[PDB]
PDB file of all heavy atoms in Angstrom:
ATOM      1  N   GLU P  40      23.577  15.238 -26.754  1.00  0.00           N
ATOM      2  CA  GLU P  40      23.840  15.700 -25.429  1.00  0.00           C
ATOM      3  C   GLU P  40      22.660  16.479 -24.950  1.00  0.00           C
ATOM      4  O   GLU P  40      22.539  16.771 -23.768  1.00  0.00           O
ATOM      5  CB  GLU P  40      25.076  16.611 -25.408  1.00  0.00           C
ATOM      6  CG  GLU P  40      26.393  15.870 -25.501  1.00  0.00           C
ATOM      7  CD  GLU P  40      27.544  16.814 -25.222  1.00  0.00           C
ATOM      8  OE1 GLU P  40      28.037  17.441 -26.200  1.00  0.00           O
ATOM      9  OE2 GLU P  40      27.955  16.951 -24.046  1.00  0.00           O
ATOM     10  N   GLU P  41      21.811  16.888 -25.894  1.00  0.00           N
ATOM     11  CA  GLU P  41      20.587  17.592 -25.627  1.00  0.00           C
ATOM     12  C   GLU P  41      20.725  18.948 -24.891  1.00  0.00           C
ATOM     13  O   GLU P  41      19.870  19.312 -24.099  1.00  0.00           O
ATOM     14  CB  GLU P  41      19.581  16.706 -24.934  1.00  0.00           C
ATOM     15  CG  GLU P  41      19.157  15.554 -25.819  1.00  0.00           C
ATOM     16  CD  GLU P  41      18.297  14.557 -25.134  1.00  0.00           C
ATOM     17  OE1 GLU P  41      17.615  14.871 -24.129  1.00  0.00           O
ATOM     18  OE2 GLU P  41      18.288  13.375 -25.581  1.00  0.00           O
ATOM     19  N   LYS P  42      21.747  19.712 -25.280  1.00  0.00           N
ATOM     20  CA  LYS P  42      22.013  21.009 -24.652  1.00  0.00           C
ATOM     21  C   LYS P  42      21.291  22.118 -25.368  1.00  0.00           C
ATOM     22  O   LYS P  42      21.029  23.156 -24.805  1.00  0.00           O
ATOM     23  CB  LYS P  42      23.528  21.321 -24.684  1.00  0.00           C
ATOM     24  CG  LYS P  42      24.378  20.485 -23.712  1.00  0.00           C
ATOM     25  CD  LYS P  42      25.805  21.002 -23.687  1.00  0.00           C
ATOM     26  CE  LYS P  42      26.611  20.485 -22.503  1.00  0.00           C
ATOM     27  NZ  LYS P  42      26.842  19.006 -22.520  1.00  0.00           N
ATOM     28  N   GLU P  43      20.932  21.883 -26.630  1.00  0.00           N
ATOM     29  CA  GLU P  43      20.256  22.842 -27.469  1.00  0.00           C
ATOM     30  C   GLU P  43      19.127  22.235 -28.278  1.00  0.00           C
ATOM     31  O   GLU P  43      19.374  21.516 -29.231  1.00  0.00           O
ATOM     32  CB  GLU P  43      21.233  23.488 -28.443  1.00  0.00           C
ATOM     33  CG  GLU P  43      22.453  24.050 -27.764  1.00  0.00           C
ATOM     34  CD  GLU P  43      23.513  24.410 -28.744  1.00  0.00           C
ATOM     35  OE1 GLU P  43      23.215  25.170 -29.714  1.00  0.00           O
ATOM     36  OE2 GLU P  43      24.665  23.962 -28.614  1.00  0.00           O
ATOM     37  N   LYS P  44      17.887  22.532 -27.870  1.00  0.00           N
ATOM     38  CA  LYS P  44      16.713  22.022 -28.522  1.00  0.00           C
ATOM     39  C   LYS P  44      16.230  23.046 -29.550  1.00  0.00           C
ATOM     40  O   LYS P  44      15.825  24.175 -29.204  1.00  0.00           O
ATOM     41  CB  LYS P  44      15.614  21.798 -27.462  1.00  0.00           C
ATOM     42  CG  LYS P  44      14.293  21.396 -28.073  1.00  0.00           C
ATOM     43  CD  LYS P  44      13.309  20.901 -27.028  1.00  0.00           C
ATOM     44  CE  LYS P  44      12.839  21.996 -26.139  1.00  0.00           C
ATOM     45  NZ  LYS P  44      12.080  21.414 -25.009  1.00  0.00           N
ATOM     46  N   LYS P  45      16.237  22.681 -30.817  1.00  0.00           N
ATOM     47  CA  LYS P  45      15.805  23.585 -31.882  1.00  0.00           C
ATOM     48  C   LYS P  45      14.319  23.764 -31.829  1.00  0.00           C
ATOM     49  O   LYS P  45      13.829  24.860 -32.078  1.00  0.00           O
ATOM     50  CB  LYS P  45      16.246  23.025 -33.234  1.00  0.00           C
ATOM     51  CG  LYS P  45      17.752  22.796 -33.373  1.00  0.00           C
ATOM     52  CD  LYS P  45      18.583  24.052 -33.103  1.00  0.00           C
ATOM     53  CE  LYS P  45      18.329  25.125 -34.153  1.00  0.00           C
ATOM     54  NZ  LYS P  45      18.495  26.553 -33.603  1.00  0.00           N
ATOM     55  N   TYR P  46      13.583  22.704 -31.490  1.00  0.00           N
ATOM     56  CA  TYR P  46      12.158  22.809 -31.417  1.00  0.00           C
ATOM     57  C   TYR P  46      11.462  21.637 -30.742  1.00  0.00           C
ATOM     58  O   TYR P  46      12.060  20.566 -30.616  1.00  0.00           O
ATOM     59  CB  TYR P  46      11.560  23.006 -32.813  1.00  0.00           C
ATOM     60  CG  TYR P  46      10.208  23.631 -32.825  1.00  0.00           C
ATOM     61  CD1 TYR P  46      10.060  24.998 -32.586  1.00  0.00           C
ATOM     62  CD2 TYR P  46       9.074  22.871 -33.040  1.00  0.00           C
ATOM     63  CE1 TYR P  46       8.792  25.597 -32.567  1.00  0.00           C
ATOM     64  CE2 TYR P  46       7.805  23.443 -33.028  1.00  0.00           C
ATOM     65  CZ  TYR P  46       7.677  24.808 -32.796  1.00  0.00           C
ATOM     66  OH  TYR P  46       6.446  25.404 -32.797  1.00  0.00           O
ATOM     67  N   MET P  47      10.251  21.855 -30.312  1.00  0.00           N
ATOM     68  CA  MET P  47       9.427  20.847 -29.699  1.00  0.00           C
ATOM     69  C   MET P  47       8.078  20.996 -30.301  1.00  0.00           C
ATOM     70  O   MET P  47       7.378  22.010 -30.092  1.00  0.00           O
ATOM     71  CB  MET P  47       9.357  21.021 -28.196  1.00  0.00           C
ATOM     72  CG  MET P  47       8.575  19.905 -27.460  1.00  0.00           C
ATOM     73  SD  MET P  47       8.541  20.149 -25.685  1.00  0.00           S
ATOM     74  CE  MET P  47       7.496  21.540 -25.627  1.00  0.00           C
ATOM     75  N   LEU P  48       7.705  20.021 -31.121  1.00  0.00           N
ATOM     76  CA  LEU P  48       6.413  20.000 -31.843  1.00  0.00           C
ATOM     77  C   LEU P  48       5.438  18.993 -31.169  1.00  0.00           C
ATOM     78  O   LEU P  48       5.784  17.863 -30.905  1.00  0.00           O
ATOM     79  CB  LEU P  48       6.688  19.604 -33.282  1.00  0.00           C
ATOM     80  CG  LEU P  48       5.559  19.364 -34.276  1.00  0.00           C
ATOM     81  CD1 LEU P  48       4.751  20.656 -34.580  1.00  0.00           C
ATOM     82  CD2 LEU P  48       6.185  18.841 -35.538  1.00  0.00           C
ATOM     83  N   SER P  49       4.228  19.449 -30.878  1.00  0.00           N
ATOM     84  CA  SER P  49       3.205  18.653 -30.296  1.00  0.00           C
ATOM     85  C   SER P  49       2.802  17.577 -31.286  1.00  0.00           C
ATOM     86  O   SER P  49       2.720  17.813 -32.489  1.00  0.00           O
ATOM     87  CB  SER P  49       1.954  19.494 -29.909  1.00  0.00           C
ATOM     88  OG  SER P  49       0.893  18.710 -29.458  1.00  0.00           O
ATOM     89  N   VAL P  50       2.489  16.379 -30.754  1.00  0.00           N
ATOM     90  CA  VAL P  50       2.082  15.242 -31.563  1.00  0.00           C
ATOM     91  C   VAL P  50       0.624  15.439 -31.997  1.00  0.00           C
ATOM     92  O   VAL P  50       0.102  14.695 -32.843  1.00  0.00           O
ATOM     93  CB  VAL P  50       2.280  13.963 -30.721  1.00  0.00           C
ATOM     94  CG1 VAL P  50       1.346  12.840 -31.213  1.00  0.00           C
ATOM     95  CG2 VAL P  50       3.686  13.511 -30.830  1.00  0.00           C
ATOM     96  N   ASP P  51      -0.031  16.511 -31.480  1.00  0.00           N
ATOM     97  CA  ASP P  51      -1.419  16.806 -31.824  1.00  0.00           C
ATOM     98  C   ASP P  51      -1.684  17.125 -33.276  1.00  0.00           C
ATOM     99  O   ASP P  51      -1.014  17.921 -33.935  1.00  0.00           O
ATOM    100  CB  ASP P  51      -1.935  17.919 -30.901  1.00  0.00           C
ATOM    101  CG  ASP P  51      -2.203  17.420 -29.466  1.00  0.00           C
ATOM    102  OD1 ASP P  51      -2.037  16.218 -29.221  1.00  0.00           O
ATOM    103  OD2 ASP P  51      -2.574  18.271 -28.625  1.00  0.00           O
ATOM    104  N   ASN P  52      -2.699  16.432 -33.818  1.00  0.00           N
ATOM    105  CA  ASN P  52      -3.157  16.610 -35.180  1.00  0.00           C
ATOM    106  C   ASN P  52      -2.155  16.304 -36.262  1.00  0.00           C
ATOM    107  O   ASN P  52      -2.435  16.459 -37.446  1.00  0.00           O
ATOM    108  CB  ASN P  52      -3.747  18.052 -35.338  1.00  0.00           C
ATOM    109  CG  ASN P  52      -4.897  18.311 -34.361  1.00  0.00           C
ATOM    110  OD1 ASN P  52      -4.852  19.206 -33.510  1.00  0.00           O
ATOM    111  ND2 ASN P  52      -5.966  17.530 -34.496  1.00  0.00           N
ATOM    112  N   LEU P  53      -1.001  15.768 -35.859  1.00  0.00           N
ATOM    113  CA  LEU P  53       0.038  15.417 -36.846  1.00  0.00           C
ATOM    114  C   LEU P  53      -0.367  14.110 -37.542  1.00  0.00           C
ATOM    115  O   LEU P  53      -0.894  13.211 -36.956  1.00  0.00           O
ATOM    116  CB  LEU P  53       1.374  15.240 -36.178  1.00  0.00           C
ATOM    117  CG  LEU P  53       2.082  16.488 -35.799  1.00  0.00           C
ATOM    118  CD1 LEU P  53       3.479  16.121 -35.280  1.00  0.00           C
ATOM    119  CD2 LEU P  53       2.207  17.389 -37.044  1.00  0.00           C
ATOM    120  N   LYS P  54      -0.037  14.058 -38.840  1.00  0.00           N
ATOM    121  CA  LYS P  54      -0.279  12.874 -39.639  1.00  0.00           C
ATOM    122  C   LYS P  54       1.022  12.693 -40.428  1.00  0.00           C
ATOM    123  O   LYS P  54       1.918  13.525 -40.372  1.00  0.00           O
ATOM    124  CB  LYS P  54      -1.467  13.129 -40.589  1.00  0.00           C
ATOM    125  CG  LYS P  54      -2.377  11.939 -40.778  1.00  0.00           C
ATOM    126  CD  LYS P  54      -3.661  12.071 -39.970  1.00  0.00           C
ATOM    127  CE  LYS P  54      -4.478  10.785 -39.989  1.00  0.00           C
ATOM    128  NZ  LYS P  54      -4.847  10.324 -41.347  1.00  0.00           N
TER     129      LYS P  54
END
Side-chain angles (χ1 to χ4, degrees):
Chain P
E40 283 190 272
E41 295 173 26
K42 288 187 165 66
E43 308 168 52
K44 176 169 69 190
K45 303 302 294 149
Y46 202 76
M47 184 179 69
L48 175 66
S49 174
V50 156
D51 287 356
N52 301 118
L53 284 185
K54 218 102 190 303

